[PDB]
Symmetry: C2
Subunit: 370 residues, 2 copies
């Protein structure tokens, strides 16, 4: 039944952008009279470059351009139509609602999630979404938000960053949140943003552009977050929890064997009763509660992911709009999308049932894509 | 049967321990009457507990035990004999000489490397070693040390941490060192130690023992270090440089595709001519200048490593003595060793030429054993 579904694809909707425009501290959005697109500024490392451009506009324009590729639904549909994608499960891009004040967060999350539902309603059958949660608000407010979003048309899950309520995903206070999401039968899509402390990349990292934080920081962040969840016993505590991991689990398929060896050889864990004979291994969790996207750019990585979770638990994605062509027309086909489709072909063969599964039928099944 | 070679195996030799025993600041070693092993104190926090045991013989022993598994050559030979290993290429364990002052470092490195050669001489044909360098010293002193160790019997390469001279492996000042090691035809074994800043593991990390820093920190450190090397053009600048990466490249085989995609989609690099059409990709470097150890614990990881570098560039190792059995007899076979041997068998088949290659014949060829 080969339909192509993209489960890793992002937007900033109008209500979100307008909210950021009203902000006076990071993250926030400024519209310069020189440029046709607003500027998104997240890190305080470039709020300074704003002041330069605000006074001496000869300086480089700060932050990221809030392009049509992030903000325009028509642009999203164009991307889909020109890259052979039938269905997208769209999600709010980083940094989501993580930075919002507790009192304002639930109301803003409501408006933004409402707008996502309405965007999906413009192209019935071709658009679904993962909702973001107001995780800076009290847990009761978070649980109320979950019960709300599960009743929004076209919502098929939750997108979650690695910070949780502020102390990461092994925070015990998140257990009722995971239970609420799991009982609502909402898939959790875990996505990176915070990366690693920039010092790890050394004094020359800027010479390499964004390669180190994007190529290494993001997948390593995802790995650490899920490893923490696993070690805390979250998957054992919430057995109906299902997680989709960005970028083929970051590095989890490659390090799963090492994680297992380190656990069974850890003196502290063994001697305090944390390594019982009946323990569910990370391999078991990878087959039973984890889905992996196929945003890995190589048959080498993809084969490791398939070996870890199985071909029925891998899902195609593009990470649109984060990797546009630098020299070819951005309104033409994107090689960053094509790279992963090619990885799928080389890994399991073109026209195979496994290819059809990874390219969309797994997503159709798991997310009940009407 | 073809030779089984272990290329990832560590020791703290007597001269190194004696040097650490004389130190008054981290890292240091101290012995006690109530302990049958010396104590390795590597962290600032442990100094509090040192004085407590230094005062009271009732209090808890500080640091971690310098066991026979680290310190005894007879113990190393016993491990080899009970885990089916014919040859070990031994190396000084972390923290090596990184902490030493520039003036004392070359003399200490000289003594330690000479002792490694002498240890190998006690079991001719079964022991070789990677030498450690005094990288806190001036580069001219480092180059002199390199020319010395290459002429020590049984030396077959260099072991290198990720800090380099103090600013990592993409430090321009380190280029003459890479050139010197490469021109001496010495393999560089890159090993982790510094991991990641502990804050990345969150407030509950101690509840998980050492799992997060060891399972994630070490391989991620290796990945970042080699990626920095690659982006800096070190492999292009030193075309005869050959490097063996600890723990199957950390995560490099899994992230190589992502690294490449991020490079070709980087505006800054593309617009500044750093992504020319004839650039040697990370895949090419993985096949031409990188060897990977097989210390990966699963056929899943091993298959990715083999796909990346080829079966002729994978080498078996044990990481002895870092993962002893917790309950099982430590003088019997080690699970941590057999896991990797089993991974090889499950990946390329027991008795195959690929298996014989990974289990030792690659090391025999590349290191001239
Ligand atoms: Zn993303
Ligand atoms: Zn090691």
């Amino acid at each position: 039944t080969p339909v192509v579904v993209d489960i890793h694809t992002h937007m900033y909707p109008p209500s979100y952008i307008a909210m950021l425009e009203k902000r006076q501290t990071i993250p926030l959005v400024r519209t310069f009279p020189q440029a046709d697109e607003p500027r998104l500024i997240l890190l305080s490392s470039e709020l300074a470059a704003l002041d330069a451009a605000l006074a001496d506009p000869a300086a480089k324009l700060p932050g990221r351009p809030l392009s049509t590729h992030f903000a325009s639904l028509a642009q999203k549909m164009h991307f889909m139509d020109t890259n052979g994608i039938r269905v997208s499960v769209i999600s709010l891009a980083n940094p989501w609602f993580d930075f919002l004040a507790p009192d304002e967060a639930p109301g803003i999350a409501d408006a933004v999630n409402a707008e996502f539902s309405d965007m999906c309603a413009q192209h019935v059958g071709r658009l679904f979404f993962f909702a973001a949660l107001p995780l800076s608000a009290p847990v009761d407010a978070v649980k109320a938000s979950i019960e709300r979003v599960k009743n929004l048309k076209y919502c098929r899950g939750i997108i979650l960053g690695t910070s949780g309520l502020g102390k990461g995903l092994d925070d015990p206070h998140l257990l009722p949140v995971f239970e609420a999401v799991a009982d609502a039968k909402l898939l959790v899509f875990l996505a990176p943003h915070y990366g690693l402390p920039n010092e790890v990349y050394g004094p020359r990292s800027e010479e390499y552009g964004h390669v180190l934080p994007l190529a290494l920081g993001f997948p390593m962040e995802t790995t650490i977050a899920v490893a923490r969840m696993y070690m805390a016993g979250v998957f054992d505590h919430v057995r109906n929890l299902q997680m989709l991991l960005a970028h083929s689990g970051g590095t989890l398929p490659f390090l799963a064997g090492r994680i297992e060896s380190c656990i069974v050889h850890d003196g502290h864990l063994v001697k305090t009763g944390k390594v019982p004979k009946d323990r569910r291994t990370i391999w078991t969790v990878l087959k039973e509660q984890i889905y992996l996207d196929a945003v890995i750019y190589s048959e080498v990585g993809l084969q490791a992911a398939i070996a870890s979770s199985g071909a029925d638990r891998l899902m195609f994605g593009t990470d649109h709009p984060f990797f546009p062509p630098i020299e070819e027309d951005v309104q033409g086909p994107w090689d960053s999308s094509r790279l992963n489709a090619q990885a799928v072909i080389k890994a399991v063969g073109e026209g195979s049932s496994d290819a059809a599964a990874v390219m969309g039928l797994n997503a159709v099944r798991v997310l009940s894509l009407k």
